[PDB]
């Protein structure tokens, strides 16, 4: 609905086709607080 | 071959994760997301406003 | 050598070097240190024509051309690349140079109708297409642009060549001056660019005060908790060097004020009314009035700019290297107001001299008869 920044518009050429349907990803503010905390002298990967 | 490059972009975008990760900064890895040294403090030229 | 090259950088490339050299030296500006949030949204420009090509069916091979297509796309709307070119640009031989025809003109007609077309005729012309709309005069407008007709409209010439009737025809041409020539680009909030001022210029009620400076001027503070007084020498010296400086600095600022001051009062002709018409002041007539050297002036003259109430000048420009403009300005006056009291031949050179331009009240009714004008017999 909101956050994703590419599941926001291969959401909406869904609805128009009539096919309900997503593909999720991650949500876009997650991958920024990710930046914000390796501004610090922290380090947050992500991994597996 | 720009097939390749334009949709890559958007087909690796599904590239997935788990489990993560936190640890303290090393200066060698701090210099490793580096792609430059902020030497000066000013933000824009005013003159022209390319930064 | 310090201080001359201190006076003529610009304003803002002064600060920059005194940034650096403050960095040097133990002086600080003013910091503004008391000790004890959104400026962003989205816009859309061409992402609107990428939202065309995600919902629109193109398959996969064809949208990536579609995609190659809006990054030549100008602020303009028309394509830099040539159609071979970005035939270069997907590297690839399946493209045939006439697939990508096929998606060109089909990007073309979502709205804005006419976009992305090379050589501005397509645009009108594939305008046309989706205008069609069967009806009415295009039939015979259509063949003017697409047959190369387009040397008109230079100018009846078309009549011989394009043999339609005459008048009937401008009713196809008013219907073609309808045509948005290249839609869309439209205003961003950009201010745009400002160029900050450089001293100040306006007037107060019945005066002019170009007392400037626009806060362009550094304010810098010698004094810090370093007071104490080989190393000791070195603060000195140091200390020297920087009680130096800002005496240099506040002396930029006072010479650009007094320049300022006799620059404007030479040229008001100009300031007052309209631009232009400036009375050419040399440098060494601004430098005879006061002490300053013709090469300081000419140094503080480069770089440092002026607001002015019409327009942003130089002040370099205020230098260089009669009778018709003297005659619209008497015709301007003597028209405009004089809605019972008529103007008289001694208020107009009144008028001027308040101005700063400088007529006899002899000249000034030889321009007034050359303007045709009887003076003073129109009245109430």
Redesign the interface.
């Given at each position: 609905k909101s956050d994703d920044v590419?599941g926001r518009?291969?959401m909406?050429?869904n609805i128009?086709?009539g096919n309900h349907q997503m593909?999720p990803?991650?949500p876009e503010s997650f991958n920024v607080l990710l930046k914000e905390i390796?501004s610090?002298?922290?380090?947050?990967?992500?991994?597996? | 071959m720009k097939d390749l490059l334009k949709f890559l972009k958007a087909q690796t975008k599904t590239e997935e994760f788990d489990a993560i990760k936190i640890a303290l900064a090393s200066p060698d890895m701090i210099r490793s997301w580096s792609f430059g040294e902020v030497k000066k403090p000013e933000t824009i030229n005013y003159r022209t406003f390319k930064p | 050598q310090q201080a001359i090259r201190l006076l003529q950088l610009s304003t803002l490339e002064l600060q920059q070097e005194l940034q650096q050299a403050l960095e040097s030296n133990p002086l600080l500006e003013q910091t503004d240190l008391h000790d004890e949030y959104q400026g962003e949204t989205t816009q859309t420009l061409q992402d609107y024509l990428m939202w065309q090509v995600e919902l629109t069916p193109f398959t996969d091979t064809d949208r990536a051309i579609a995609t190659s297509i809006v990054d030549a796309v100008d602020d303009t709307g028309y394509l830099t690349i040539q159609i071979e070119d970005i035939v270069d640009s997907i590297g690839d031989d399946e493209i045939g140079l006439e697939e990508v025809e096929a998606v060109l003109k089909r990007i073309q007609r979502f709205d804005p109708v006419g976009v992305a077309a090379k050589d501005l005729r397509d645009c009108l012309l594939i305008q046309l297409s989706q205008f069609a709309k069967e009806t009415p005069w295009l039939e015979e407008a259509r063949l003017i642009i697409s047959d190369h007709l387009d040397l008109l409209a230079n100018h009846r010439t078309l009549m011989r060549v394009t043999r339609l009737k005459e008048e009937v025809l401008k009713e196809a041409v008013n219907l073609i001056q309808s045509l948005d020539p290249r839609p869309g680009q439209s205003i961003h909030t950009s201010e745009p660019e400002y160029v900050i001022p450089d001293v100040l210029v306006r007037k107060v009620s019945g005066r002019w005060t170009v007392e400037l400076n626009a806060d362009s001027i550094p304010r810098l503070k010698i004094n810090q908790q370093y007071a104490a007084m080989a190393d000791g020498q070195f603060i000195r010296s140091n200390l020297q060097e920087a009680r130096w400086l800002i005496k240099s600095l506040e002396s930029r600022n006072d010479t650009l004020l007094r320049v300022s001051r006799c620059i404007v009062e030479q040229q008001q002709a100009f300031f007052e009314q309209g631009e232009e018409y400036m009375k050419p002041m040399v440098l060494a007539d601004i430098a005879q009035a006061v002490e300053m050297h013709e090469s300081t002036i000419s140094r503080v003259t480069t770089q440092k700019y002026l607001h002015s109430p019409r327009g942003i000048f130089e002040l370099k420009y205020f230098f260089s290297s009669s009778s018709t403009a003297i005659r619209a300005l008497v015709k301007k006056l003597i028209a405009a107001e004089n809605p019972a009291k008529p103007l008289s031949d001694s208020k107009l050179t009144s008028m001027l001299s308040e101005q700063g331009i400088m007529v006899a009240r002899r000249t000034v009714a030889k321009y007034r008869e050359s303007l045709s004008i009887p003076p003073s017999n129109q009245r109430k």
């Open positions: 590419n518009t291969k909406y050429k128009v086709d593909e990803g991650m390796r610090l002298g922290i380090n947050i990967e992500l991994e597996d | - | -």
